[PDB]
């Protein structure tokens, strides 16, 4: 099976490498991770806390994690470049809380010991990985609920590594925060509802019945986020029926030929080739699980064909 | 395609129809529901929540349901039979709080006046659909988080409809709440966690350092469930290698010849014929979504061969 053949046969064209961000394209790097090695790293599901993680397996560029003590269904793919793993001692020396195994409370953990206790290693530190802004931790914000997409909340910047941040809704679930850049199109200033006619989400038991952002700062005592810090995310320019590869949502192992079905700005929507349209879904084009033709093949991980 | 020629070639054996519960068994019912109906009925990710529902589409002896002024994205398939949906006005007689379409406030809302809004019209109550036990509205008890099943908590029975009540975690978002039933695999009386040298999960922010049931069920005036109401669930008598029809988790529209892969006490692990292993998965062995051979031909429902 061939991507050039492919392509004339279906008389197509691949999305250009050149509109795909670094953290998408060809990375310039052997994947150094093996199998049994341990490190820490975000917990997707409740992307504030970090965890005690061990490498369960390792595929072409990627990597599948394993939250130890913990079932395997939590097992997760990313790539070996992640921005949200960490080597070994990154939680102490940042200041961040680490939390640890299933079955083991805080002051029962150390790396040392727990390291001798597994006979195991650290991944090196030379295998993980600048642009200054005005977003600082405490800083308050309107952002999009990722889950519920139509509700824009008041929120706050409660953690930052280099260019992410993390962003929570006040007086609600952890499980509801995740981390962002700048850029990214679900966070605004303060009163850009105001200014666009539409509903804050207020926190739960707060003066819902007029709710005021300048009452709000000053009762916690903290700043707003400057409007300067707030860039503009550049539209992507992946066009209807270009051609892709791109991990199956699904069964992330898997790695699928893949067409751009349709756009919007910060959007494309993925359509597997020899699959139904049912299985099309949406996906942030800036994503590092999808990539361009070849990426596969450059990598080391296999490709699934069209059905 | 053929279930018996299919059955001989593979020379295996159906899950026995007598082995399903009744709300998995052949329907002794046609689906009398209809594209554009209007019906009341619980948010599967927010189980607390009754909503207001119309039927979207109808494929055999289930419909898709779509939340009024929501994306399609949140639609959902249940059987024309679901225990968990309602007729228009069943919250209001039965005294439950009804939460109106996106972008009405419940001031804005009542079903007289939505219904002419939309020139529609309810499901007729002829649709829809005993057994006396000790659980009552504010009873506490010890539950599994689903959602984090390694997990055992101080929870609350919430709300009671018939046999099925619903399982609230104290001080812990709705949305880790869930309905269950007298049997459920996942409930225990309290002090059952004593008992069984578990970790019992407090509520956040309470006398964590040596909590107790006696002093806690005083602060809250309420009373435990009796012991005496934790019915015992019979296993289900599903065997490895038998056959069956599953709704495909991953796209429920679909319906796929399967293979009971491996078993425990209350699930089977589910395999698609003809798929790799790797899509293989857990499932309650109770669950509506389970179902005896032949049951996509009897309800007029399509049926996915092996791939
Ligand atoms: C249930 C839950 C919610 N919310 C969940 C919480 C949500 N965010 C939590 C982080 C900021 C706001 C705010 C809205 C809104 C509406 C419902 C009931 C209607 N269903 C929700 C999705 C399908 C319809
Ligand atoms: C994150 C969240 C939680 N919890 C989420 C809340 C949960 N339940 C909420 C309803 C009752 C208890 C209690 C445990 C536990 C551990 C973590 C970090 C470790 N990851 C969780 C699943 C994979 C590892």
Known sequence: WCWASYLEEEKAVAVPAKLFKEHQSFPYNKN??????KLEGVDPEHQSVYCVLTVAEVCGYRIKLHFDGYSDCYDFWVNADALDIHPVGWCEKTGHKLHPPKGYKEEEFNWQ??????????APKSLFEVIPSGFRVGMKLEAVDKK???????ATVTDMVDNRFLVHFDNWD???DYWCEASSPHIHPVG????????????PGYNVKHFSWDKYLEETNSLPAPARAFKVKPPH?????????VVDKRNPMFIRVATVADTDDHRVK???????????????????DIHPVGWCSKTGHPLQPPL
Chains 1, 2 share one sequence.
């Not at 519920?148 to 008041?154: A, K, R, T």
């Not at 996906?283 to 590092?288: E, K, R, T």
């Open 32 to 37: 150094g991770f093996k199998v049994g090695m």
């Open 113 to 122: 010991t727990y390291l001798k206790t597994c006979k195991a290693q650290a």
């Open 148 to 154: 519920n997409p139509s509700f824009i909340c008041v």
């Open 174 to 176: 952890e499980s509801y």
């Open 192 to 203: 850009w509802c105001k200014e666009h006619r539409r509903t804050l989400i207020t926190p």
């Open 237 to 245: 320019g992946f066009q209807k029926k270009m051609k892709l590869e």
């Open 270 to 288: 993925v359509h597997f080739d020899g699959w139904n349209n049912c299985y099309d879904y949406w996906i942030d084009a800036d994503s590092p």
